[PDB]
């Protein structure tokens, strides 16, 4: 019923590991899901609408996990608090590299993708800034930069840096080193005078 | 003679302020340069080869300026040393926003662009790492992260962050705040324990 939808989504994610969206046809999506081309079009208006949904589930999965984290503070030092948080994005997006990769290229092309990306980045930065302000109220962090400006730049560091390594871009931090690399820069910029 | 070449380049840069490369024709480039379509094709094989050259001159201008900077150390504190360096990329790319913007989208499309980007990023990161290692040998910076890993992440922060503000992306640091924002994170991650 809507299992067909889930089949189209899985087919697309599987196919995107091996070629870009450009070299995948609706034909290829329908085939994989075991439906006709016109039945495909019942569920989605384009291959692009399939990417968008994929990215939507990845982004919301990241977001929900961060909500679960924020509701249950891990009992640990500040370094470990930040690491646990950044890890939500490392694991989540790192488990969906094809979708991550395709979503990011699609930003230049698709206004819906760009907006979806935009909404969640705003949210996570807002959250980052809230935690930093809390850390300054507490007395644990110095009032250096505007919290929102710092949060913005740290989050953009994480987008670029997580995605370069996920794609094996030259240059990039190796994936097995990227978590530590980011946490250092976060902790040191948030706590440093 | 090759003034026609310079005319094509200026026409393209002027046109790119107002629409993407997709909505600019070879016709539009030839017109602006005051040549025929076939004479255009004498000088460049595509609109894309025109972008590539544009980006090449922007990137080399950035690079040469950093070479001039490295050869003549500005006599100042460490914060100001880094700021002066990051400023080379702020000013250079910030004076060529249309080209910057178009080059970055073209990375997903054009393998020549991606490689050109790749080469210079490797160079600037290598330079960043060399300066940090020097700062650790001097005794001025602690041996925290692997210098090259740190350099990689800081440079990727700068790419993403400079270009988001240049494009007025939501979200982004405002352009009049981005220099200070970056220098803070650099100095604090390089000098911090
Ligand atoms: C895919 C990267 C998108 C943004 C990455 N943001 C990020 O790392 N955060 C968000 C704030 C949390 C407290 C943990 C750190
Ligand atoms: C367009 C951004 C590309 C990379 C930006 N790199 C950057 O800011 N650097 C390079 C190292 C210098 C010592 C100054 C700081």
From Swiss-Prot, chains A, B:
Disruption phenotype: Cells lacking this gene leads to ETH hypersentivity. It comes from the Bacteria. Residues 25-44 bind DNA. SUPFAM superfamilies: Homeodomain-like, Tetracyclin repressor-like, C-terminal domain. The keyword Repressor applies. One of its GO terms (biological process) is response to antibiotic. InterPro entries: EthR_C, Homeodomain-like_sf, HTH-type_TetR-like_transc_reg, HTH_TetR, Tet_transcr_reg_TetR-rel_C_sf. Inhibited by tert-butyl 4-(3-thiophen-2-yl-1,2,4-oxadiazol-5-yl) piperidine-1-carboxylate (RF1) and 1-(thiophen-2-ylacetyl)-4-(3-thiophen-2-yl-1,2,4-oxadiazol-5-yl)piperidine (RF3). The record marks 155, 158 as: Inhibitor-binding. Keywords: DNA-binding, Repressor, Transcription, Transcription regulation. GO terms for cellular component: cytosol. One of its GO terms (molecular function) is DNA-binding transcription factor activity. Homodimer. Binding of inhibitors to EthR induces a conformational change in this repressor, which is then unable to bind its DNA operator, consequently allowing for increased transcription of EthA and bioactivation of ethionamide (ETH). Involved in the repression of the monooxygenase EthA which is responsible of the formation of the active metabolite of ethionamide (ETH). This is HTH-type transcriptional regulator EthR. The lineage of its organism: Bacteria, Bacillati, Actinomycetota, Actinomycetes, Mycobacteriales.
């Amino acid at each position: 019923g809507d299992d067909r939808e889930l089949a189209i989504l899985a087919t697309a994610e599987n196919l995107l590991e091996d070629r870009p969206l450009a070299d995948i046809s609706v034909d290829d999506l329908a085939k994989g899901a075991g439906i006709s081309r016109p039945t495909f079009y019942f569920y989605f208006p384009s291959k692009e609408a399939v990417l968008l949904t994929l990215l939507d589930r990845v982004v919301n999965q990241a977001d929900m996990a961060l909500q679960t984290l924020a509701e249950n503070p891990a009992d640990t030092d500040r370094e470990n608090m930040w690491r646990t948080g950044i890890n939500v994005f490392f694991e989540t997006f790192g488990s969906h590299k094809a979708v991550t990769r395709a979503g990011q290229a699609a930003r230049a092309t698709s206004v819906e993708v760009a907006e979806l990306w935009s909404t969640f980045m705003q949210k996570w930065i807002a959250y980052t800034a809230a935690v930093i302000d809390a850390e300054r109220d507490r007395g644990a962090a110095p009032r250096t930069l505007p919290a929102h400006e710092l949060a913005t730049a740290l989050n953009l560091m994480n987008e670029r840096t997580l995605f370069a390594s996920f794609a094996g871009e030259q240059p990039s931090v190796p994936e097995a080193r990227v978590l530590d690399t980011l946490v250092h820069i976060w902790v040191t910029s948030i706590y440093g005078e």
